[PDB]
């Protein structure tokens, strides 16, 4: 909907190179606000956004205590998985998991999320009702039976509906000057002939936030989406993003093409033409 | 704030 919080856990076993490594990052919408890495000298939770640093010392000690324990739990999970699939302790394996809550335009919990992957594939997932699971395979069903017996879905539903929502709001306020302030994209069209017959029109959008945006090339007001070449929205490095759309058009028809830009930061949807 | 405690896979 309007706002969200996410955590991204990555655990990788590395036989011979040491113990399984655990990394965690936290996002509010598209702003990373904290990180944890077990490979550090003396691992600690660390700020990745100035506004989170309003939290007292107790906050960071507490978070570190948690990510420290996750390090162990996932090492134990990597073992279990290896068991589930009958794999040697010689191969390297990864566990990934992303969970979090979504807010509506009015601070209400829209829906919750929790998914685990094994070697970059769907493994297990908490369903929309936050009371059931969807296992990907026979191995995942073993985890499910334990989690059903352990009542994990109930622990999450209480979190996604409770602490996750309270604290997401808490951050939106504490950092409203950067989280709720939308940065409109700077735009402009470019033209580049490919031959004597055709030419490329490219529509730019830069320095924008959040990352959610819609660049669509129209020919006579009709979206040429299937013909529009997009690139993955990318990080400018300053917390704002970049993107461009491109189309190959015939020479002389250039003026029948408009570029529309939709973004939370734009009062009204922009319309752009190549202006030689 | 992260999930307080992780369940074992």
């Amino acid at each position, epitope marked *: 909907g309007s706002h969200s919080m996410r955590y991204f856990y990555t655990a990788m076993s590395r036989p011979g190179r040491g113990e399984p490594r655990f990394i965690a990052v936290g996002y509010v919408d598209d702003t990373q606000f904290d990180r944890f890495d077990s490979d550090a000298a003396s691992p600690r939770t660390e700020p990745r956004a100035p506004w989170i640093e309003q939290e007292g010392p107790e906050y960071w000690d507490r978070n570190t205590q948690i990510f420290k324990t996750n390090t162990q*739990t996932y090492r134990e999970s990597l073992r279990n998985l290896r068991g589930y699939y009958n794999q040697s302790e010689a191969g390297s394996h990864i566990i990934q998991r992303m969970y979090g809550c979504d807010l509506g335009p009015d601070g209400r919990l829209l829906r919750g999320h929790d998914q685990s992957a094994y070697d970059g594939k769907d493994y297990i997932a908490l369903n929309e009702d936050l009371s059931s699971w969807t296992a990907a395979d026979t191995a995942a069903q073993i985890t499910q039976r334990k989690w059903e017996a352990a009542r994990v879905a109930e622990q999450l539903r209480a979190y996604l509906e409770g602490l996750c929502v309270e604290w997401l709001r808490r951050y939106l306020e504490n950092g409203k000057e950067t989280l709720q302030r939308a940065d409109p994209p700077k735009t402009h069209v470019t033209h580049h002939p490919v031959s004597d017959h055709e030419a490329t029109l490219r529509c730019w959008a830069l320095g924008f936030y959040p990352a959610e945006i819609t660049l669509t090339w129209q020919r006579d007001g009709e979206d040429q989406t299937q013909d529009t070449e997009l690139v993955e929205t990318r990080p400018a490095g300053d917390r704002t993003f970049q993107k461009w759309a491109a189309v190959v058009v015939p020479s002389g028809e250039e003026q029948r093409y408009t570029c529309h830009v939709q973004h939370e930061g734009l009062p009204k949807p922009l319309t752009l033409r190549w202006e030689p | *704030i992260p999930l*307080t405690e992780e369940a074992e896979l």
Partner: T-cell receptor
Amino acid sequence: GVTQTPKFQVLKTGQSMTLQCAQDMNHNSMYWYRQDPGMGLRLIYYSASEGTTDKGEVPNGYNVSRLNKREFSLRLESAAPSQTSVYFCASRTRGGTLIEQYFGPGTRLTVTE
Amino acid sequence: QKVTQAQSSVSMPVRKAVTLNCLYETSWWSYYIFWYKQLPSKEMIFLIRQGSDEQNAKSGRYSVNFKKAAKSVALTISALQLEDSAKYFCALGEGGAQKLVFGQGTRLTINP
């Protein structure tokens, strides 16, 4: 479930001794509590897994070792009369809602001069 | 001071019901409360758990009055049997990997 030996013990001041604990339940978090005559329980050491041990409300005079996941041992080192107490081992699952700790029968320990 | 049980010992006629008080102190955003009952043999048996974000817990004859704001979590035992005679402990479990701080216990005596 969670077995603990010895169940009774007497010590002369300045003695070392080890209490043994093993949980047959496949739990992950283990604890060593100490209960004085009229008081309640207080944590000494605990461990989230093997190779990792943490304090500890009153860790002084005690060392500990999680030699593996099923077993968690405690030591007295230099027995002192003030260390007379009932030492409880504890085990519990992580994740989900059934996170209560399960105690062993206990170890009544008197230390005499 | 972290966990306080205001009654050192309480007497009750059989068949009735009794409430045992327990007040705690925590700055944690996630915790649990546990009620245990200790036998003369020192054996420590588990009774009921109360989550920080849970409805009032009820497990058979054991029920809990969770007053999150006042940080009060009094236990109530109904239909008092004579086995109920024991020492009852209220334990705070804040975590994480939760290291319990125990009340100092209440002595429950059921009269015949």
